């Protein structure tokens, strides 16, 4: 459940995620700095609320939601998304719709680390965090 | 200036870190680790702020700076500081505040090579580092 998810995590190994960048229409600047940067997300829980800050290099970014319940979102990217997320199971998935279109990404813990898969149309990366 | 550090860096050298990190009140664990690892340093000079990276066997950290501003930072050794970094002559000055105590670091060039002196009181420890 999200209990699982409640931690300050590190990326250690990021796959196919330059390529991921280009179908979001990523710029060219933000995506050397996006497969250079590690950063540390922090998962917790407000109430209910869900908390995902992320520490990075390029942007800070910080996002309170309620499982369902849509909100909107400015991404570190600038796109300006409604987003949902939801517990699929033992995993979160996070909706992003903008300008007609819509990313996913599917957050999980496997072997204690957290994976997240993110899955734009025929464009897929992963991610792999490790708890620090 | 700023420009002489823009490279990267890898640690050849330590003296005296080991007494160092006791005084800093390192635990035995991380001092353990902290005595063998070589790591490697990326400066640069991003926009109007100043990017400092390592990669070690131990971990990896990141932060992101303007010269003279105050900023928190989480150091390797998990202290959470107020942090700031400025330029004293041709020298990095990089000085952390945690718990009401202090630590700098002085970054320099000398003979093609990075030095920091780290010092802690009456306690100072000098770490070299070669251009890659
Ligand atoms: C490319 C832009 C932002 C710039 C990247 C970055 C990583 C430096 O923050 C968007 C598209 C998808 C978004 C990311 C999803 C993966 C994560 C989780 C985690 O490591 C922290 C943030 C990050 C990289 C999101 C940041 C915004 C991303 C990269
Ligand atoms: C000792 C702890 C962290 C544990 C050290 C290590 C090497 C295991 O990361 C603190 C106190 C002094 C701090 C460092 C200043 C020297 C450098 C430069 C470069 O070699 C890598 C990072 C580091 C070691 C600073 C961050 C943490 C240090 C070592």
């Given at each position: 459940m999200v209990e699982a998810f409640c931690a300050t995590w590190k990326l250690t190994?990021?796959?196919?995620?330059?390529?991921?960048?280009?179908?979001?229409?990523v710029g060219?600047?933000?995506?050397?700095?996006?497969?250079?940067?590690?950063?540390?997300?922090?998962?917790?829980?407000?109430?209910?609320?869900?908390?995902?800050r992320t520490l990075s290099t390029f942007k800070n970014t910080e996002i309170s939601f309620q499982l369902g319940e849509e909100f909107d979102e400015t991404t570190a990217d600038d796109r300006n998304c409604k987003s949902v997320v939801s517990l699929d199971g033992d995993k979160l998935v996070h909706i992003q719709?903008?300008?007609?279109?819509?990313?996913?990404?599917?957050?999980?813990?496997?072997?204690?680390?957290?994976?997240?898969?993110?899955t734009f149309g025929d464009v897929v990366a992963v991610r792999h965090y490790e708890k620090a």
């Open positions: 190994n990021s796959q196919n995620f330059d390529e991921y960048m280009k179908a979001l229409g060219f600047a933000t995506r050397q700095v996006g497969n250079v940067t590690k950063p540390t997300v922090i998962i917790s829980q407000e109430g209910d609320k869900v908390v995902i719709k903008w300008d007609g279109k819509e990313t996913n990404f599917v957050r999980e813990i496997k072997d204690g680390k957290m994976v997240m898969t993110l």
